[PDB]
Design a protein around this ligand. Structure first.
Ligand SMILES: *[C@@H]1O[C@H](CO)[C@@H](O[C@@H]2O[C@H](CO)[C@@H](O[C@@H]3O[C@H](CO[C@H]4O[C@H](CO[C@H]5O[C@H](CO)[C@@H](O)[C@H](O)[C@@H]5O)[C@@H](O)[C@H](O[C@H]5O[C@H](CO)[C@@H](O)[C@H](O)[C@@H]5O)[C@@H]4O)[C@@H](O)[C@H](O[C@H]4O[C@H](CO)[C@@H](O)[C@H](O)[C@@H]4O[C@H]4O[C@H](CO)[C@@H](O)[C@H](O)[C@@H]4O[C@H]4O[C@H](CO)[C@@H](O)[C@H](O)[C@@H]4O)[C@@H]3O)[C@H](O)[C@H]2NC(C)=O)[C@H](O)[C@H]1NC(C)=O
Ligand SMILES: *[C@@H]1O[C@H](CO)[C@@H](O[C@@H]2O[C@H](CO)[C@@H](O[C@@H]3O[C@H](CO[C@H]4O[C@H](CO[C@H]5O[C@H](CO)[C@@H](O)[C@H](O)[C@@H]5O)[C@@H](O)[C@H](O[C@H]5O[C@H](CO)[C@@H](O)[C@H](O)[C@@H]5O)[C@@H]4O)[C@@H](O)[C@H](O[C@H]4O[C@H](CO)[C@@H](O)[C@H](O)[C@@H]4O[C@H]4O[C@H](CO)[C@@H](O)[C@H](O)[C@@H]4O[C@H]4O[C@H](CO)[C@@H](O)[C@H](O)[C@@H]4O)[C@@H]3O)[C@H](O)[C@H]2NC(C)=O)[C@H](O)[C@H]1NC(C)=O
Ligand SMILES: *[C@@H]1O[C@H](CO)[C@@H](O[C@@H]2O[C@H](CO)[C@@H](O)[C@H](O)[C@H]2NC(C)=O)[C@H](O)[C@H]1NC(C)=O
Ligand SMILES: *[C@@H]1O[C@H](CO)[C@@H](O[C@@H]2O[C@H](CO)[C@@H](O)[C@H](O)[C@H]2NC(C)=O)[C@H](O)[C@H]1NC(C)=O
Ligand SMILES: [Cu+2]
Ligand SMILES: [Cu+2]
Ligand SMILES: [Cu+2]
Lengths: 636, 235, 195
């Protein structure tokens, strides 16, 4: 019965903005009544709250932007999640989903239903469609969407007048985004536009926040996920990759964010479904004038000073006034939880969310204090207030760099690793060599037909993306005696924006983990010959909505999880003629430990680059090797 | 439609030469600004803000979209004009041109394209004064008296100049509301700029002799009483 | 490459020769060959200009803007025959750029022991003529312009009577270069040898 259930849940994601077209779903929406069917829900309080909200009309109006950073939106989405998750039977769950689809905003319903499907036992096999297919308007420029609407409604008669559009195959018409948006931010935004505007990266951020919502309290499974450590590690990896891209395109180090003025602005060029332009941050934005920006920055400074005091003093304050030490090396998780100010933080009243205030300030979304129903505020969020568009703005990377400065301060106070924790007896690496590192640009097609308001075709968008050829890394190692070992590869830049070789201690923060795997080392001489195509950290493209629908309706793979980095974004572009980089191979013992499942050997994720490392403490540690490589770009 | 009737790029003929282009410009701008000030007083917004050369407090968000779907440029609140931006150079050029206009007004004459002095002290020189201020194709000397109002519009439109060209030729531009006559009036900055130009015009008019009791009087005509029946407005 | 400079004249000798080693840019000899139809026989002047092709961001710079960025690298005379011709200019022959002047020690030796006219104090050094470029190639634009020969030691420089920056002193547009066939714009790549 998997196929039919998946088909129905897909039909729930066919046209969010438009109303229900399938008749029996209308019958269910008109027939079901929560009041009399309270007995089928475990959480009766959620049922009462939902009934009250739906009766008083105290809900976010339909056809309006939705943001989780607003309090009332969080309350509404949490209540709906509690109601949906408390469904005893799958039938009750589906019937509540239909009713909410009828009586709930599109974005909120999609998000809550996806979260419920991911975290429900009865729906551990259902596959949810990609976000960039349900709402294409968050990943393509407004001109593209308007042209799509025109070419569709024209009946493809004036389409042949358009030279940009073309018919690649029957029933599909494709455009070019190569020639468009001549007006753009420029500054530091254009050279890295092939990485920051990538659809897959924003989709990955959205899916990550689907797996770990800020408004959802962890269960036994989510309590072993080490939420804070994942936050820190993922932010570090993203910032290291972004810095590598900037060095590749010659833009320099990530600008440091102050408290007086921000020089770089952002113009999104995106449009909401209704047609409201996004807020724009001007260049040379002033933060020390008579504006709400000043008050927001003062609150941000207070909260960050509280975090700094907690880090330095070595303990945090409970909600009653007790001191809880965080000086042990295993307190990184609670530190991250406190910094994030999620619902799992011990004390959110004193440790508040300054990152959201940073996002509000640097989004320059004019607060007009407008409310509907004498209730829910009406907000026009900027790109930074949406996880599916935040990564397009450099300000996000600047803010995360500040948070990573806080994290580095905390890690600095920790004792440095010893020659016993960081050494494996009688394992010496001889030589490490990669076959080649080449990158090239290629074309890809995305389906944006779900935005078209069909009455009674399939428009696609062509985009340019980076990719790399398969590469093999071969290392020879002395093994001493037989062992079961783990090998980790790290990649870092070798020269900074000016030309001086970066010391290893500084590079410790710029090392990007690209592969980790097990091996059984024999006695004597060995050979590791890892191929990039075998790594499980990076995955291939997930099947599109159309492909999944075809494979389902016509009637598995475990190499496509929503919480993995796309393969084509693993390797930096480099330069034509070669760009130098540093590879680091580290071998350690194997210390023995589907929607949201990731686990490796029990140890800090960034080991051994989480703490600062110095050359003088690597003498006597032979199982770590630092080689130099060159990354090339194939021009086309 | 007004700019259709008197395009800046069209030279006047016998009919358009009797239209007194400059006087029409001055009169229409004065009427528009007086009506706008009356509206502001009616809605309790106060006097029209005076435009400086350092910072503009009031911004504008149009909410309009072009046919293709490109959003209009947005001017932020508290825009800074004395930083390391092209705004500073534009403002410097504007100041130079306005100082040239002020010197021409005060000295009582304007300079021809050859270097001759032509007096503008008579009361009938308002037309040529307006033509010079507008810097249209009918101005005697556009090379020395240049169009600072267009530079003001460019500066206060905050249209990011990206120096993009097609055909190795025609630049591609995304104009703001102030650069289009069909959308300029939506922005208060237009009224501020026109108030500055009207300050220049008032300076010129102040230098003129005041009317006498002979020019301003009609023999044996006395008004007794004036009364209107009612003045009501509705939406 | 490395070069040595003599700084002994600063030393306050009482009753040696210290030198300083410095790194400088240089280029290998290059030859430019152009084929031209000549019509009838003439005495002509050929000028070469070099400019960048892309700006700091990546957009191709329009010719009008590049008019201010054109660097004159060579100017010389020729006698064009009738029919097909061939110019084969070698960088080592240009008189605009000169070689290093003899140092004080070298000049003192050559004088006390007991001419050349390719060393004037008012000429650009040869090794600074060509931009460094990039490893892997950097695109640039060469412009060859041919005009008529309009007939015109310490401080002496004179060429055909005309504006020095002709024809790049005034702005130039593509649409006004139709009908002018004696001007050609080619693209080249400059490479840097890493060491
Ligand atoms: C079915 O559906 C419903 C609706 O969908 C779901 O209901 C939600 O359920 C969750 C979980 O139960 C609730 O969250 C918790 O709520 C309680 C109660 O908060 C309410 O009352 C507060 C006022 O009383 C509190 O303060 C007074 C003094 O002023 C005090 O006398 C009283 O005893 C009590 O402490 C309100 O303040 C509060 O909201 C107000 O304040 C909020 C904060 O400023 C503000 O945001 C609101 O807008 C409003 O202004 C609310 O009305 C909370 O006590 C509890 O708080 C814990 O977690 C937060 C972080 O989320 C943390 O900051 C707190 O310090 C506290 O942390 C303790 O518990 C954590 C786990 O919950 C734990 O991880 C911490 O370590 C800590 O516990 C450990 O340490 C502490 C000492 O630090 C120790 O005491 C403990 O024993 C332990 O050792 C949560 O916020 C939602 O409120 C509720 N929402 C609704 C709409 O119903 C329901 O979950 C669903 N059920 C099922 C089965 O699915
Ligand atoms: C058919 O179709 C064609 C195409 O559609 C139409 O052609 C247009 O026709 C109009 C009208 O004839 C032209 O406008 C006039 O052009 C002339 C010539 O300008 C050209 O040449 C200039 C260079 O030569 C000038 O300067 C040098 C020194 O450097 C000097 O030696 C030489 O004698 C001459 O003075 C160029 O500079 C100019 O363009 C360049 O400069 C422009 C300004 O910076 C710049 O914008 C351009 O981009 C370019 O850089 C051009 O190539 C102009 O002389 C004439 O200028 C008058 O008007 C302007 C204001 O518009 C004013 O500033 C000048 O001072 C001058 O004003 C005198 O004439 C006015 C009337 O024209 C008069 O109102 C003024 O009072 C003044 O006349 C009186 O006072 C002066 C002393 O101040 C006195 O000398 C007089 O005798 C008199 O007493 C116009 O700009 C268009 O150029 C032309 N366009 C094209 C594409 O062909 C044609 O009209 C159509 N025909 C029909 C029948 O329909
Ligand atoms: C893009 O996605 C739409 C669905 O949003 C696809 O629509 C399908 O088109 C085929 C054409 O043969 C139909 O048989 C299916 O029934 C359609 N499905 C739906 C849900 O309408 C469209 O084919 C996709 N196009 C591409 C190129 O992937
Ligand atoms: C650097 O310059 C000094 C002159 O300032 C040179 O000094 C000469 O050294 C030779 C050595 O055999 C003497 O014979 C000359 O009499 C010196 N001349 C003077 C004026 O003192 C010195 O040789 C130069 N060194 C180099 C390497 O060029
Ligand atoms: Cu959409
Ligand atoms: Cu500034
Ligand atoms: Cu201000």
């Amino acid at each position: 019965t998997v196929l039919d259930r998946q088909y129905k849940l897909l039909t729930l994601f066919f046209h969010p903005h438009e109303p229900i077209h399938i008749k029996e779903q209308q019958e269910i929406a008109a027939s079901w009544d929560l009041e009399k069917n309270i007995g089928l829900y475990e959480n009766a309080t959620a049922v009462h709250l939902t009934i009250q909200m739906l009766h008083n009309n105290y809900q976010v109006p339909r056809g309006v932007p939705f943001t989780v950073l607003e309090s009332v939106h969080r309350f509404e989405i949490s209540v709906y999640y509690s109601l949906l998750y408390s469904a005893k039977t799958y039938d009750t769950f589906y019937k509540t989903a239909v009713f909410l689809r009828q009586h709930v905003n599109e974005n909120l319903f999609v998000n809550v239903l996806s979260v419920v499907i991911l975290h429900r036992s009865d729906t551990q096999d259902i596959r949810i469609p990609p976000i960039y297919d349900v709402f294409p308007s968050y990943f393509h420029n407004g001109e593209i969407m308007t042209t799509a609407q025109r070419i569709t409604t024209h009946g493809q008669r004036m389409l042949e007048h358009y030279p940009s559009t073309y018919v690649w195959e029957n029933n599909v018409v494709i455009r070019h985004n190569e020639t468009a948006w001549p007006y753009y931010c420029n500054t530091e935004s254009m050279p890295v536009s092939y990485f920051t505007h990538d659809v897959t990266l924003n989709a990955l951020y959205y899916n990550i926040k689907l797996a770990y919502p800020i408004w959802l309290r962890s269960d036994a499974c989510a309590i072993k996920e080490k939420r804070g450590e994942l936050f820190f590690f993922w932010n570090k990896q993203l910032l290291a990759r972004y810095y590598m891209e900037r060095l590749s395109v010659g833009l320099g180090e990530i600008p440091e964010l102050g408290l007086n003025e921000v020089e770089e602005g952002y113009v999104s060029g995106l449009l909401y479904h209704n047609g409201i332009p996004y807020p724009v941050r001007p260049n040379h934005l002033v933060l020390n004038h008579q504006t709400w920006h000043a008050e927001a920055i003062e609150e941000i400074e207070v909260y960050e000073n509280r975090i700094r005091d907690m880090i330095d003093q070595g303990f945090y304050i409970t909600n009653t006034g007790e001191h809880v030490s965080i000086n042990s090396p295993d307190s990184i998780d609670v530190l991250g939880r406190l910094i994030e100010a999620n619902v799992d933080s011990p004390n959110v009243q004193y440790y508040k969310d300054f990152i959201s205030i940073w996002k509000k300030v640097l989004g320059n979304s004019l607060v007009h204090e407008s409310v509907a129903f004498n209730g829910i505020p009406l907000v026009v969020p900027s790109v930074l207030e949406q996880y599916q568009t935040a990564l397009r703005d450099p300000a996000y990377y600047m803010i995360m760099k500040r948070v990573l400065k806080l994290f580095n301060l905390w890690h600095e106070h920790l004792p440095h690793y010893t020659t016993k924790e960081l050494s494996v007896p009688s394992v010496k690496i001889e030589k490490v060599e990669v076959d080649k590192l080449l990158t090239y640009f290629e074309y890809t097609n995305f389906n944006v037909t779900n935005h078209l308001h069909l009455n009674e075709k399939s428009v696609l968008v062509q985009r340019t993306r980076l990719n790399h050829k398969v590469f093999t890394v071969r290392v020879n190692v002395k093994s001493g005696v037989a062992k079961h070992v783990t090998v980790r590869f790290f990649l870092a830049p070798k020269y900074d924006s000016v030309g001086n070789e970066i010391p290893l201690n500084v590079n410790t923060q710029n090392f990007l983990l690209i592969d980790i795997f097990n091996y059984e080392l024999k006695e004597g001489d060995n050979l590791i010959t890892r191929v990039s195509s075998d790594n499980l950290l990076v995955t291939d493209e997930i099947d599109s909505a159309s492909v999944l629908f075809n494979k389902v309706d016509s009637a598995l793979n475990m190499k496509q999880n929503i919480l993995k980095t796309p393969r084509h974004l693993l390797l930096p572009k480099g330069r034509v003629g070669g760009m130098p980089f540093v590879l680091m191979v580290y071998i350690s013992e194997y210390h023995a430990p589907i929607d949201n499942t990731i686990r490796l050997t029990s140890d800090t994720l960034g080991f051994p680059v989480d703490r600062p490392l110095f050359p003088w403490m690597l003498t006597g540690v032979e199982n770590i090797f630092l080689q130099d490589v060159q990354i090339y770009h194939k021009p086309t």
